[PDB]
Symmetry: C2
Subunit: 683 residues, 2 copies
Amino acid sequence: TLQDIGVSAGINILSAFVFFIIFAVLRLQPFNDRVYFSKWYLKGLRSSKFLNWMPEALKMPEPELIDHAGLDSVVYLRIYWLGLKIFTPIAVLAWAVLVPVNEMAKQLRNVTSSDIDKLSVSNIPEYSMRFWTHIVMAYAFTIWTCYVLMKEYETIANMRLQFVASEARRPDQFTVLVRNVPPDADESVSELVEHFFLVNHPDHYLTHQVVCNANKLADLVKKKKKLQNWLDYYQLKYARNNSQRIMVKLGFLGLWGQKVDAIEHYIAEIDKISKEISKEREEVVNDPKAIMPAAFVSFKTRWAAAVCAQTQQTRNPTQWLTEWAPEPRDVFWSNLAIPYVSLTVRRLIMHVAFFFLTFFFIVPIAFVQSLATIEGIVKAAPFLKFIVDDKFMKSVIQGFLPGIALKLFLAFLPSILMIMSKFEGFTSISSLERRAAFRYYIFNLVNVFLASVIAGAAFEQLNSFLPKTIGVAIPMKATFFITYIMVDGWAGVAGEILMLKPLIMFHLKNAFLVKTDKDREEAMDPGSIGFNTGEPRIQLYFLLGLVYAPVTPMLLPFILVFFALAYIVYRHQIINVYNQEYESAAAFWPDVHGRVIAALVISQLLLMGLLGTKHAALAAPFLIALPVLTIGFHHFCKGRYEPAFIRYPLQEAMMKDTLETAREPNLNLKGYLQNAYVHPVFK
Amino acid sequence: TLQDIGVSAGINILSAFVFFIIFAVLRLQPFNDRVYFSKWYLKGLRSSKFLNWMPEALKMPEPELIDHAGLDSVVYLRIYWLGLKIFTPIAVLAWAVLVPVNEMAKQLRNVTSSDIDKLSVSNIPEYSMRFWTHIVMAYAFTIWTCYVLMKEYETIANMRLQFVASEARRPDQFTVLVRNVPPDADESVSELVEHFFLVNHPDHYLTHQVVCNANKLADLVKKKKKLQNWLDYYQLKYARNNSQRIMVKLGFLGLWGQKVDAIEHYIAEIDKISKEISKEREEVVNDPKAIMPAAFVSFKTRWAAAVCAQTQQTRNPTQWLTEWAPEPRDVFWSNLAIPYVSLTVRRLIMHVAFFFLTFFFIVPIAFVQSLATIEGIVKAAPFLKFIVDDKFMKSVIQGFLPGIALKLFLAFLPSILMIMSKFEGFTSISSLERRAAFRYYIFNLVNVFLASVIAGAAFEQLNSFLPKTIGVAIPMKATFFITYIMVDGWAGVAGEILMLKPLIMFHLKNAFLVKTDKDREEAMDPGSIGFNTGEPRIQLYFLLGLVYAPVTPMLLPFILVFFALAYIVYRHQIINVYNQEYESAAAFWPDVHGRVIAALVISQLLLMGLLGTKHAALAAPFLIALPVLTIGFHHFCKGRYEPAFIRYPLQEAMMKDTLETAREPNLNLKGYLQNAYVHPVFK
């Protein structure tokens, strides 16, 4: 139904262009320049007609951006350049051979009920030349994709090695985290670690740092910060207009409280919380059982740090488990209070919760796939019946409401998955987001692709009135995919550049919360690159574009548009907003390699599930080779490069430390490290 | 056909008992005591009515045997104790529930042609109670096997840790082998390694040793040794009887040579070969291009050695590849002349050769499975037709000729697989034999189990005249398995204890080759434990016993007999012969864990392939769980214990080195190590 595609594309191009215009209007205004130019303030480079920025973004080269935002963001954006590198030959050759097989003569808005139309290129049985060409194309597609990811993986590896070589000092290039300290009745954990490492690591141990469990104190200090926010807001309200409210601590859910002045209320409760903070501080600093069986341990050289990170320590591999340590900003200090014993319990519980969610969630996807000619209830006929209601507005609905509905029902999902990986326990934001991304990708591949296509094949003609079924169900699913890629591709990228919610929160806090200056830096909140959201969306688009690559080229151009548009929009954003919260130098890239490989193999399997419907069609002896070839090449690249992403060589550590000690022969490493990792709460 | 089993078992018990008798006769004779008591001569514990040894062997405890032969042999024998630990409950419960389902009422010599007999427990369709009991039994079988291998794997791990802790000094507890030295135009390989390690490993590098390529010199020195053997034999012939032969260097393939005296011949050719050895020695010691890009590198502590072994060195993981080093006796000095570039070429070529062999080899297995009522050609009727020829001798043939034929056609196969893994290139006898064992197990599982069962299902009634097929073909295959387990179980173990070929070679060399004393140690050749042969046979028996465990318990007792018999025979042998050629402290045990797991999962899959023939029989929701549970538990144990077998912890190295330096504060490590690893040819 090409007209549905047309009207949806038109309305979305319009909405995107409107969004770009409003962005120009709000950006050119300097009185809110802070939010649209968060960076250059955090970097300290500034203080205090519309498409003009599109050429502006594509000016700053790669190395300067790397120095600017960090290699993380650069590679995360390079993902899009990758995908375009895969797909542009995909688009050209798919549209160049698949369609001229003989829009000229393809599906052209057809349905399976055409049991009498009997159009030319319609079904399986023999189609020798057609099927062989399809196979040859699938083969060459996979060949090209393999070449591309091999080259890209090599480049990312070289980039990461060069970066960490030239990277300056960080207090986590020595420190290593050791898990599972076996308890002893007499010796405290700290001195256990001291003895172990003094005797086990000679000439290289420098100092350790016991991990505490102040999660209760962290909770109460967050409570204090919240209460101070409330005090400041209410005080600004009183200053602006002299009046005291009787809200019982909530206003909305506030009971029949008096709060005649409410200033004495807040000052007294703030004092109470502060003094209880004092008692909590003293008791946590005076409690051995608060000590946890882990402690950050700092070395004297990168060499020793790497060596102790990459090798086991004690006979029992569940005992004294050692691993690289993140930045003091990076480590999630609320998950070092979970003993390693209950980790697997938590992990399996979260697997259970994830399965229940990915199963409860087919109900919304089916409710979305109800996008068919079925309309509202009969009792509201005057409500849902108008002059025509079935001419063009129906194309608008079929091309618009599905996309917006699905994108609305994938709204809280990253929040839920972040909660899942958080209470799972990982202690490092980098790994938290990588895990949540993996989970969200699994969620997408299960629910919002396979569940949708199966449900669609189910609704019309009722599973064909009780392989050959999907062999006529795939195309209209390509249609729904075009609709959704529109809505949560181009319009979504527009919303990304607009930055609405941070803007409005910024203005609200300036109006009500901010009382003076120097809180602007506190007030301004550049967010983050949001890897957990950006990564799975693009991986889904890889999945969908490859699986439809030889079946229907009509999908590809929309993919290519989205890739270029997001590339440019995110380059601008990274340059000007979205500071890197942590710094994991190209950590996740093997995840990309794997997930793209997985989408590739799924593509080949589904192409099998279509083509092989004719038994003994002489197709299986080729189509089964491709999944194996993909997996074999994936192991080739895994073992050929992934080292640089998974584990740090030693000659590099030696070279880096030689150069550092040449430049700075008078660095007090011990003083620099001892106060690191103490705790955010502990000053 | 129970009578075939009976006659085969009877003749094999007789032949085994005869073999034990001849063994007693030859052992009690002291004039050949050397060969049947090879050890206690190599260990230097001795110089210069029949079942009496069976209690004698089961006296010496485990630790003393470990100190005697080595932990390798102890665990290799403990394999059998393992298997009995699995199977005894398997036998008891299989025979206790499977048969009393209701020999009393089971297959009892039936064929699929009984389309009118229509016996009770015969086919699939519903058999609710029977099939559910079969399922429950498969479940409990797998549970028990999992418990057993978990406990056994734990014990082997504890044993290996304790052993290497108490193990005394060996010149390969420091040395590490480094592969792929990147060539440089000016610097030689040795000094490249010197610079790299002095700068990269400080305070711990001790010395290296360049790997040479004297494989040509090794070949010519083996030629010299062979020629000296020929000289000694011919000289003893002349001394015994004064006569000179005219054999032209081969005798059999000897041409019309003169050899009027042939003593001047051999002395002159020996001199020529010796002087050419001299020139070869000088040119190899004076040739840079003979140097290979690898060199044995020795450290000062176990700590440093382990650290440099378990961590990558240079950016390129194909460059300077480092790995643990074996003993000077252990390393296969003929495969250090193969550059790492051509290794993968060789590996793939050997995969090709292995596939062609495992495919050409179905022809002999089918020729064996021709064991049916088909007899010799018609033209030889007086030759193959006798008074009866079809009463009892046919049972003898059907229970005897298959076993002997198959065991004869698996004769050269370990030799071929050793050649395969040798010219593949591995440099370490330990890994050579482990790889050859893996290959031989693959060969068995492909050809001599699956090919045999499929061919058998194919011959009778011609694939049932063009699942349900094997569902009546499995039993007679259990019959053929009983026959073969007989022949190459019990009789094979008898032959193992008899030690015929080393005996006869020993007597021949004493008679003809030996000229004096002090060559007895040279003359005596205890062979080796022959892991490459013993391991796959027992793994095959695991495969077969587990796959038939709930289908036909009648197989199990023969397995149990073989296990106990080989346990005792090999305990005796290990005690008294079969010195350990190398010493890999429980290296291969994870291979055992994996291969038994593989047999277990294959068992569960075949039980599926039988039981599920009734579609929707409510069996699949359980039978698919078992393979996954097995694989999951296998990863549980892998990650929970395999460390101790795959990679050496560090606290252990530190403790060992502390204790050594406490005991021997005056050990010249450098002098002790520098001359190690030089080459066997180089003194």
